Amino acid sequence: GLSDGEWQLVLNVWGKVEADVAGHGQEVLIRLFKGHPETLEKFDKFKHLKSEDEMKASEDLKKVGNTTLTALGGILKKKGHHEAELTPLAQSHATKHKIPVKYLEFISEAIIQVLQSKHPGDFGADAQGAMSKALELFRNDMAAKYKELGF
Ligand code: HEM
């Protein structure tokens, strides 16, 4: 339940992400791995990255980051009516990448932390609150799909 007004602030912030998705994507993943290092273990391609300097140099990290944020933007733009963009995501993350719902909370916070560090003048009190409700709706739908898949 975001109001139209909140969907709008979400989409205005998202616009800044879209002017550089791969740079924001890389920062988001280095923020999650620095803050919850155990999340790094689900990424077989990144098992072996040892420093922030190796994460910054990694070509595959830039790509997964990019892919992650392109898929999130596609959902957000649906404004809550994302059942179909969401199912395949839940299927893959539940059954193949095996991501627990808590990890969805860690990535939500890295996303907020990156928007906050990069766009402080555009990520005021209002945009913070709208963004945060949108990520929460996203986690709650994911969790519901998980339960339904029997996980
Ligand atoms: C914003 C929430 C997320 C979105 C939108 C997202 C999106 C995606 C997409 C679109 C793919 C590629 C296709 C697929 O396998 O479904 C992918 C792959 C993957 N995701 Fe996520 N993801 C999210 C959260 C996470 C989290 C929190 C983790 C682990 C902590 C994770 C782990 C993985 C792994 C291990 C892969 C395979 C990557 C590879 O080596 O190519 N995802 N993700």
Side-chain angles (χ1 to χ4, degrees):
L2 270 73
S3 66
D4 291 355
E6 283 159 341
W7 274 126
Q8 214 46 70
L9 286 170
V10 163
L11 298 181
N12 303 344
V13 177
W14 202 253
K16 283 3 223 62
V17 171
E18 282 177 317
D20 179 17
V21 171
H24 288 77
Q26 166 200 251
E27 300 251 0
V28 159
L29 287 188
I30 285 171
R31 279 307 274 251
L32 174 73
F33 298 148
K34 262 9 241 184
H36 315 264
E38 66 274 27
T39 64
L40 179 48
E41 309 322 305
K42 329 296 314 214
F43 294 92
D44 295 343
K45 284 210 202 330
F46 311 134
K47 306 268 75 307
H48 47 273
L49 302 164
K50 322 295 222 55
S51 56
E52 191 153 311
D53 303 296
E54 294 182 15
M55 286 168 181
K56 290 184 253 152
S58 176
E59 182 172 304
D60 290 341
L61 192 148
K62 199 166 207 203
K63 294 185 217 141
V64 170
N66 184 77
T67 298
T68 301
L69 298 195
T70 299
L72 185 58
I75 289 170
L76 290 184
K77 284 180 189 225
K78 302 316 302 291
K79 296 171 160 138
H81 304 116
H82 52 232
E83 179 93 357
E85 296 66 23
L86 208 99
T87 303
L89 207 80
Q91 294 167 151
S92 92
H93 289 57
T95 89
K96 193 213 167 198
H97 313 295
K98 323 294 202 46
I99 308 306
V101 165
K102 300 155 179 156
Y103 284 18
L104 298 182
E105 304 166 27
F106 301 152
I107 209 174
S108 296
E109 73 169 36
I111 287 158
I112 308 305
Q113 294 167 332
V114 172
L115 284 181
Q116 170 73 36
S117 327
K118 287 180 93 76
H119 313 292
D122 292 285
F123 192 64
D126 272 345
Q128 282 165 42
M131 186 67 58
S132 144
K133 272 164 106 348
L135 298 172
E136 185 167 354
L137 168 58
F138 161 79
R139 319 192 280 275
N140 299 156
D141 285 359
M142 289 282 277
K145 287 271 12 217
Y146 270 36
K147 291 182 273 107
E148 174 166 330
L149 305 181
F151 301 99

